[PDB]
Amino acid sequence: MHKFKLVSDYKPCGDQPEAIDKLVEGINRGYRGQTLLGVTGSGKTFTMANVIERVQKPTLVIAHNKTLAAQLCSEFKEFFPNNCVEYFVSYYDY
DNA sequence: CATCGTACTGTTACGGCTCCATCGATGGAGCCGTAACAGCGATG
């Protein structure tokens, strides 16, 4: 049984630790749905990686466009080089 | 304005296969004409 390993020099700063702790506590409690009111440039990808690493559960991320999905996949590969990151988009060129 | 859907049709370049049109001369032998060659008698 493999585990999640995260490598990143950039430590959380500001409200990131509090948001991560709140999300982890809510997931552990068993809340069906939650919202992250993260502004642009605040590092939502870092918070997502942190909660995924803490929870240690399979994760499916849905994006509304291919470019954002590719950027998220590359970011998750960067944070998780040891771990496994996949990519499931449309293969129809036309 | 972006996203999705259980290997898609029609028309062109290019290489290999096949069918069809279009295209005298040299040596040997025989013959003719011309030049070349060979081939008993009587007297002192």
Side-chain angles (χ1 to χ4, degrees), chain A residues 2 4 6-8 12-14 16-17 19-21 23-24 26-28 30-45 47-52 54-65 67-74 76-77 79-85 87-92 94:
Chain A
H2 218 260
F4 268 102
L6 173 90
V7 44
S8 185
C13 301
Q16 301 203 79
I20 288 154
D21 195 27
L23 278 178
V24 167
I27 275 278
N28 283 130
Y31 295 130
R32 213 222 194 198
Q34 271 163 174
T35 58
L36 200 56
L37 195 46
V39 308
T40 52
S42 194
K44 299 180 286 285
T45 315
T47 312
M48 259 194 279
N50 270 251
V51 47
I52 290 160
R54 289 268 281 265
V55 170
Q56 300 274 351
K57 246 148 76 153
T59 297
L60 173 71
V61 176
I62 312 186
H64 79 275
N65 71 98
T67 316
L68 185 59
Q71 185 253 292
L72 276 164
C73 189
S74 75
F76 277 129
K77 279 177 198 138
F79 293 103
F80 302 115
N82 165 338
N83 268 138
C84 207
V85 175
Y87 196 59
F88 192 91
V89 299
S90 162
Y91 60 94
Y92 280 123
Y94 158 68

